[PDB]
Design an enzyme around this catalytic site. Sequence first.
Site, PDB file in Angstrom:
ATOM      1  N   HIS A  66    -115.273  74.281 -17.321  1.00 15.13           N
ATOM      2  CA  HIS A  66    -115.950  74.973 -16.239  1.00 15.13           C
ATOM      3  C   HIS A  66    -117.212  75.710 -16.664  1.00 15.13           C
ATOM      4  CE1 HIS A  66    -112.350  74.781 -13.481  1.00 15.13           C
ATOM      5  NE2 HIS A  66    -111.725  74.725 -14.643  1.00 15.13           N
ATOM      6  N   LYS A  71    -121.554  87.015  -5.275  1.00 12.09           N
ATOM      7  CA  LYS A  71    -120.964  86.323  -6.418  1.00 12.09           C
ATOM      8  C   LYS A  71    -120.925  87.352  -7.560  1.00 12.09           C
ATOM      9  CE  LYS A  71    -124.334  83.480  -5.997  1.00 12.09           C
ATOM     10  NZ  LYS A  71    -123.774  82.113  -6.156  1.00 12.09           N
ATOM     11  N   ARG A  72    -120.197  87.056  -8.612  1.00 11.59           N
ATOM     12  CA  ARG A  72    -120.177  87.994  -9.727  1.00 11.59           C
ATOM     13  C   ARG A  72    -121.610  88.276 -10.241  1.00 11.59           C
ATOM     14  NH1 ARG A  72    -115.084  89.295 -12.327  1.00 11.59           N
ATOM     15  NH2 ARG A  72    -116.513  90.457 -13.690  1.00 11.59           N
ATOM     16  N   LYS A 112    -126.886  84.061 -12.994  1.00 19.23           N
ATOM     17  CA  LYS A 112    -126.899  83.891 -11.532  1.00 19.23           C
ATOM     18  C   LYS A 112    -128.193  84.468 -10.902  1.00 19.23           C
ATOM     19  CE  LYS A 112    -121.801  83.822 -11.258  1.00 19.23           C
ATOM     20  NZ  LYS A 112    -121.483  82.586 -10.476  1.00 19.23           N
ATOM     21  N   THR A 122    -118.987  77.436  -5.995  1.00 20.70           N
ATOM     22  CA  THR A 122    -118.128  77.157  -4.835  1.00 20.70           C
ATOM     23  C   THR A 122    -118.470  78.006  -3.632  1.00 20.70           C
ATOM     24  OG1 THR A 122    -116.395  78.606  -5.694  1.00 20.70           O
ATOM     25  CG2 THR A 122    -116.171  76.248  -6.065  1.00 20.70           C
ATOM     26  N   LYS A 158    -118.856  77.184   0.671  1.00 23.66           N
ATOM     27  CA  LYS A 158    -118.341  78.058   1.739  1.00 23.66           C
ATOM     28  C   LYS A 158    -119.431  78.375   2.749  1.00 23.66           C
ATOM     29  CE  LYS A 158    -115.532  80.291  -1.791  1.00 23.66           C
ATOM     30  NZ  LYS A 158    -115.376  81.541  -2.505  1.00 23.66           N
TER      31      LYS A 158
HETATM   32  O1  LIG Z   1    -115.194  75.455 -11.516  1.00 14.01           O
HETATM   33  C1  LIG Z   1    -115.016  76.719 -10.865  1.00 14.01           C
HETATM   34  C2  LIG Z   1    -116.103  77.711 -11.270  1.00 14.01           C
HETATM   35  O2  LIG Z   1    -115.846  78.118 -12.638  1.00 14.01           O
HETATM   36  C3  LIG Z   1    -116.797  79.121 -13.054  1.00 14.01           C
HETATM   37  C4  LIG Z   1    -116.376  79.569 -14.402  1.00 14.01           C
HETATM   38  N1  LIG Z   1    -116.616  78.907 -15.549  1.00 14.01           N
HETATM   39  N2  LIG Z   1    -116.031  79.633 -16.581  1.00 14.01           N
HETATM   40  C5  LIG Z   1    -115.433  80.693 -16.018  1.00 14.01           C
HETATM   41  C6  LIG Z   1    -114.700  81.727 -16.779  1.00 14.01           C
HETATM   42  C7  LIG Z   1    -114.831  81.773 -18.172  1.00 14.01           C
HETATM   43  C8  LIG Z   1    -114.172  82.766 -18.888  1.00 14.01           C
HETATM   44  C9  LIG Z   1    -113.375  83.705 -18.231  1.00 14.01           C
HETATM   45  C10 LIG Z   1    -113.238  83.645 -16.850  1.00 14.01           C
HETATM   46  C11 LIG Z   1    -113.900  82.650 -16.121  1.00 14.01           C
HETATM   47  N3  LIG Z   1    -115.642  80.670 -14.672  1.00 14.01           N
HETATM   48  C12 LIG Z   1    -118.222  78.544 -13.088  1.00 14.01           C
HETATM   49  O3  LIG Z   1    -119.147  79.498 -13.630  1.00 14.01           O
HETATM   50  C13 LIG Z   1    -118.624  78.071 -11.675  1.00 14.01           C
HETATM   51  O4  LIG Z   1    -119.860  77.348 -11.715  1.00 14.01           O
HETATM   52  C14 LIG Z   1    -117.538  77.147 -11.110  1.00 14.01           C
HETATM   53  O5  LIG Z   1    -117.805  76.810  -9.731  1.00 14.01           O
HETATM   54  C1  LIG Z   2    -116.006  81.608  -3.800  1.00 16.00           C
HETATM   55  C2  LIG Z   2    -115.901  82.952  -4.446  1.00 16.00           C
HETATM   56  C3  LIG Z   2    -116.566  83.180  -5.731  1.00 16.00           C
HETATM   57  C4  LIG Z   2    -117.383  82.074  -6.378  1.00 16.00           C
HETATM   58  O1  LIG Z   2    -118.712  82.185  -5.877  1.00 16.00           O
HETATM   59  P1  LIG Z   2    -119.947  81.462  -6.697  1.00 16.00           P
HETATM   60  O2  LIG Z   2    -121.064  81.844  -5.778  1.00 16.00           O
HETATM   61  O3  LIG Z   2    -119.588  79.991  -6.765  1.00 16.00           O
HETATM   62  O4  LIG Z   2    -119.918  82.181  -8.013  1.00 16.00           O
HETATM   63  C5  LIG Z   2    -116.448  84.433  -6.326  1.00 16.00           C
HETATM   64  N1  LIG Z   2    -115.752  85.415  -5.737  1.00 16.00           N
HETATM   65  C6  LIG Z   2    -115.089  85.312  -4.583  1.00 16.00           C
HETATM   66  C7  LIG Z   2    -114.312  86.504  -4.053  1.00 16.00           C
HETATM   67  C8  LIG Z   2    -115.124  84.049  -3.842  1.00 16.00           C
HETATM   68  O5  LIG Z   2    -114.469  83.871  -2.660  1.00 16.00           O
END
Ligand SMILES: OC[C@H]1O[C@@H](c2nnc(-c3ccccc3)[nH]2)[C@H](O)[C@@H](O)[C@@H]1O
Ligand SMILES: *Cc1c(COP(=O)(O)O)cnc(C)c1O
Lengths: 810, 810
Positions: B351, B542-543, B548, B650, B654
């Site tokens: 991911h 988003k975070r 980002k 994701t 949405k």
């Molecule tokens: O595929 C689902 C989503 O995973 C996120 C993600 N990729 N790595 C982490 C992660 C890594 C370490 C700790 C917690 C989360 N989170 C990505 O940054 C997103 O692009 C992705 O949509």
């Molecule tokens: C969908 C969702 C995310 C992921 O958003 P990205 O814009 O793809 O990082 C993070 N937090 C919450 C609470 C969500 O529902």
Amino acid sequence: QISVRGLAGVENVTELKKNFNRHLHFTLVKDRNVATPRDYYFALAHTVRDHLVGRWIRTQQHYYEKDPKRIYYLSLEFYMGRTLQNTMVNLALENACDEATYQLGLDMEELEEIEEDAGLGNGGLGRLAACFLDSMATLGLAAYGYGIRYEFGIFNQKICGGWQMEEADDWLRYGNPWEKARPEFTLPVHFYGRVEHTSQGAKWVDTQVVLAMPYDTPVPGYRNNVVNTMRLWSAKAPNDFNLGYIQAVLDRNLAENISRVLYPNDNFFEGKELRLKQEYFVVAATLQDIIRRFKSSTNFDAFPDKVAIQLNDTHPSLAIPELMRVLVDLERLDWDKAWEVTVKTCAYTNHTVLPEALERWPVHLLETLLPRHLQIIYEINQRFLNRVAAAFPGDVDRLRRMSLVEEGAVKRINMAHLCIAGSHAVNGVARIHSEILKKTIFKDFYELEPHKFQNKTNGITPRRWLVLCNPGLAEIIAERIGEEYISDLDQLRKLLSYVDDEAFIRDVAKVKQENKLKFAAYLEREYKVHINPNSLFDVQVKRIHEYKRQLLNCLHVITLYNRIKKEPNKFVVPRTVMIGGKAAPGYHMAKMIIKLITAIGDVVNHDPVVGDRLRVIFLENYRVSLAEKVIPAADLSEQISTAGTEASGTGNMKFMLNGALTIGTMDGANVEMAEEAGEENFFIFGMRVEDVDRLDQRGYNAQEYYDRIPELRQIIEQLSSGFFSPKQPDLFKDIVNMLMHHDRFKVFADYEEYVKCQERVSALYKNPREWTRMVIRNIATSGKFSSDRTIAQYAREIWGVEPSRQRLPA
Amino acid sequence: QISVRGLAGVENVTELKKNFNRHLHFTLVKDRNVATPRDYYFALAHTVRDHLVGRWIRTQQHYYEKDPKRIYYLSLEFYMGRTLQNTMVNLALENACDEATYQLGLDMEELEEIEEDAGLGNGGLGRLAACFLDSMATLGLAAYGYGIRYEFGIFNQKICGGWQMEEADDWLRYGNPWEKARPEFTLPVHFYGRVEHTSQGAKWVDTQVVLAMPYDTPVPGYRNNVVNTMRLWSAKAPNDFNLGYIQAVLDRNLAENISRVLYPNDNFFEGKELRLKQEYFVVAATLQDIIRRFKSSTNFDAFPDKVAIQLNDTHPSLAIPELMRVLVDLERLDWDKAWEVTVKTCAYTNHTVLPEALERWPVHLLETLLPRHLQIIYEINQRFLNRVAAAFPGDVDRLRRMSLVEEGAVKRINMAHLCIAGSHAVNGVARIHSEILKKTIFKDFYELEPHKFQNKTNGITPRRWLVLCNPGLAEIIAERIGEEYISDLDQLRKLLSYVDDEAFIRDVAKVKQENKLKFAAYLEREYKVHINPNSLFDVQVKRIHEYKRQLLNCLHVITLYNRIKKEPNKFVVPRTVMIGGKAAPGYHMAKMIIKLITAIGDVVNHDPVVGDRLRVIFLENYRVSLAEKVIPAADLSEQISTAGTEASGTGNMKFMLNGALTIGTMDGANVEMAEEAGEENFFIFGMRVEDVDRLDQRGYNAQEYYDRIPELRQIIEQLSSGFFSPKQPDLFKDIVNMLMHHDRFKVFADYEEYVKCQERVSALYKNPREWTRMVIRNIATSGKFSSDRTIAQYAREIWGVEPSRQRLPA
Ligand SMILES: OC[C@H]1O[C@@H](c2nnc(-c3ccccc3)[nH]2)[C@H](O)[C@@H](O)[C@@H]1O
Ligand SMILES: *Cc1c(COP(=O)(O)O)cnc(C)c1O
Ligand SMILES: OC[C@H]1O[C@@H](c2nnc(-c3ccccc3)[nH]2)[C@H](O)[C@@H](O)[C@@H]1O
Ligand SMILES: *Cc1c(COP(=O)(O)O)cnc(C)c1O
């Protein structure tokens, strides 16, 4: 099956069966093909619990409407045991549930054995609180028990190589269906901080906050549809607590440790900070809840008309300065008015005169933890001592004896003195104990305020301690005098007119014999141990303590063994000697005593010459559920504390109700039991309190007994030489040294008379008909020792409320 | 009220009402006169939960009977959000419950707002797992989610003085009605110890034991009566743990800390021991449960035919050596057979390509904590590298690049390399990300085993993310094309034939306008903040992370502000700019970015010349329940990560489903979204991945942009000089320094094109009819981004199972 167990009507049985299947499916989320006996137990418990909630809601509604005086019983211990059978008994559901489960293909007794004890107490004091709650509900009082919901109760005891090992009692692992969490009534409790004085009084600031979350457990009265509440507090950290990030969350445990574990000491004071936090926690949360309820009816004049607070020993003694704190600092009453209210609200019960048990807290602890309370205690002391000085002018030694502050190495607060000063009533727990309080340790206080001092002899609930644990006996009794005795235990006197009735004599004896068979089978099943059910069951079950003198029993057992070995082919009444109870983990002498008992067993039980004439069994993990099994099976009850040390005892009463004869000293409630039954129907031996005092004046010299009693000398030589520990000959040197040189409880001084009295026991057991007749005379006069009698006296003489036997509507 | 919400039949409504009153009375132990809205919420939740259990039991029975291949989805995160509404939607109960509660005098929406989020995840990865569980149940797969039941989930965010503060998320305080504890299936997990080699293989001994207790939560499919299980493990100490006495009991917290708290890092690796314990804990308990279930059907040949294990990133990567451990050490398979089984069972999903996110564990940690696993990993590495050497003879640099063991200051294990070696399939999460894996970081592995590498573009569940959060939109859509699209999202293409339909254009726009009004009212109600509902709602939720590029958004906001101040009387399309999301507690730059956003707001929102033409709002505590409110209200979706950094995204999906247009880079799934809708219906700007690579080859020099773009220079001067922090002029020096000298994400390089593209957004918004038509073209082509599509591809291409839309019987 049996009459006292209630009706099994077709409608009720049908209803119970469907509710059981409903809970199995919707509550437990199981089907019959995967369900284990534990799932069945839980389905039954939820089914019975459903019958409580209606009456629980309407009881509490009723108290809201009628607004009676409320009684708050504050204890650090509630030793409840199992709840399922008790609840069935009190709701008249036992036979119906038995029928319903039988029809589903299940044995209800087997399901009952799955429930964990709620072991939130050490022994007698915690169990007294549990008995009291049952009686208060049965007598219709608006009463609440308040305590701490410990995550771990009294430890589980395992014996390994003859030694006690402790295991955590994870009693909540499978869930507790009886409690209801009430997170919506969570309350803050403060610790540490400092006191700020303003133009407008003192303020306690910069405190650390711990939250108190309540859990409510229903307490059903006996067939009166009253259901009272036991509210137990659990410690929770606030959500901004310590708020790098991860550690701050993990450090919430610091706050939540307050309700983690029950201190496992019986009759001993351990002055640790965590214990002090537990004491304040229960007090501070409880008093806010009391005041909330009182306001939901500005005028604190009427507070004592609507509230009574009963302190179960000094453990919740901080209620007194906390109440003053609230009234003076928060509600801004003047000192004198606040004190009047406090004194009229609080009453104190003392449960011990042993000096090592009395709570004396280091001032430096209170100063750091509860700085405002210390200021208040100092102010109480000053005003109290001014009254003393005015009543006894120039008696400076009286001033220092009566002070709440003890001077010395470290300054301490005497919590018993605080409780007397701030209570309108002080009681002991048996007539002899109450007299001892007025004569010795509280003599000065009695001279100043004689009207405060009362007696309230302890009791036990005949629901748990006869109907529930000994249905066979309850039945044969009900056949003759009906069922009313269950909530009016004095009616057992009617049994004296059956003392010459051959049918009754036979039934009493058959019930005992069946209890003994069932307990003997329990032993094999669960502990691979083989006992003769025709033997006299000689039992001593209670916490292990030097003052309770398990060692004196051991000396007798060895005497019997040596006499057999000396004349093997001579006849003796066979005995099974059973001793059980837990030792506090840090009490080294208690742990050695356990090891001695098992060691004697190792020798005695494997000696071919003895045969099945003498067996010594250590009963592992003694607790409420084991008491309900062994007590109905006993022939002889050992109540052998040194005169003046056992404040009351309550085990003694349980045995008397269940058809055992008693061998005992004139101590605690033993004196009143002998008085009720007649001394001729009791095996009394040993020094009275006056004889102990005479011996102490002279100087107790144990060597003298050793020198003059050859049988005793032989035992001591056996102990010292390694007869009972071949591989470690010096194993019991500490025990021998204590007995010979610093025995505070004078074991040797009662040895000769104890052995002689035990011979008289064996003589009577040889004549079954006369043994049984004496038993009937004990059972018949046991009525005084119902906790219903006890609570009626508290209610009338201390709390100022009238009991009532009237049912509420169902 | 609305059609998609199901039937409200008289029978069902009557039944719901009685079950609600039953739970209020028997379950909650309350009467109507004391019940609060929270009590009402719980009565409803138990009432709906009752409808789950029947289908739950028979689903799991069904899998036992038919024995299908089982899918185990292993994740450290499940970001579930609220459960009540979802459960109603999936069971077709929403309108009935609405009617039943309305008739009891209660507003169901109000009760829904009482439920806590289950926040057991950080963001996208945890939420993907939640969406996947919903799709797997909807598609009839025998699937189980396995994770950790954290006591504290993602922290609650408060803003104080413009700064993030963290509070513990005590989500279980009031109880969780959805879970069922299963203490009877508790399993031991081992830590520490040492390895002993015997004649008969290795043995792992002298371990510390922690117990894993499961809690099961039902996962209902969409109207097919399938209810799957999410099993979450909780850490418990054994009862003889540390077994002076008191401290030993208190020290149980050491063991139980494993499941206490979710690590709050998104896309960042923190190499702490507690995290490693969490990873092994979930893996070891889960694999025993998997093997138990497999044996309850000696022949491990068929294991991969009956089991698939999907690793959600490397966090559960220890499944690979744990499976080998079990097969080799306990079941005594030979190495080669064990490895074959393991490889065919496991599949790995990546991911992220950010280097600071990749898990690389210090060997010394594994050596102490998991000594046998380290031995196994070393053995895997040796055999894997022998295969590499044989395929690429003499390529010694390839050997060191591909090794599972990294050499250096500290030796580390590369968990991603372990996962590729021990999995039969490796996938990325959007087409561009999957290509990046094959081209860059996993290039060597792709050359060795090209067949392993796949793509599975992410998706979101249209149950939660359309029907549940945007019923108004779901309705107007169902009016035209029926209801089948809810579980077959491709049917939304039928909407393209309404793009010129004046009635549909109007309804789409009215639904948006109503969502905006309702969100604007939410803001006032709950946060005393006043916004213009006619403005363009420009949102970035988003975070908070540098990649980002919330900062790029900030630069645009300030540009708009400066342009207004330069020509105040010129017309501009009014905007409300909303930015929300949490920063990891230790991520200093993220915390500074939050403060910058609030600081810009402080200036912009109070400038009379601006009026209500520009508002900047920081949305506090962004989480799943807030997403369900703000996403339906948005006009513009900000998806502006630097090309090559957002693996998929994701949130982007949405927004597209809910009628917002997207401004974004060609990154992650944005590329496929633009492809599905047509690039003309997307606001694409900025460097592509190829342009970023070109800039890195040349050397990114930020000074050059500053020198050539006066508007940008002005903003930087405003930042440095203290325009946005008067009392602390140097407050944002760290930010300015990063942007100018070490910006890894090239914020300045995309500034000009971003601003230009934003002007094109404002131009289109001025023509409502054309904006709406473009929106319809986005909604209509959003079908590919259903997680049902995603899971069907995993099922067919990785797991080897066929989905099914067939209902089970009710
Ligand atoms: O595929 C689902 C989503 O995973 C996120 C993600 N990729 N790595 C982490 C992660 C890594 C370490 C700790 C917690 C989360 N989170 C990505 O940054 C997103 O692009 C992705 O949509
Ligand atoms: C969908 C969702 C995310 C992921 O958003 P990205 O814009 O793809 O990082 C993070 N937090 C919450 C609470 C969500 O529902
Ligand atoms: O009145 C009920 C019973 O209380 C016991 C008792 N007295 N003090 C304690 C005690 C002291 C400190 C800690 C725990 C218990 N327990 C007495 O030893 C018993 O005689 C008495 O029957
Ligand atoms: C009654 C009881 C006690 C008290 O017994 P004494 O002999 O009065 O000390 C202690 N423990 C348990 C489990 C009891 O039921």
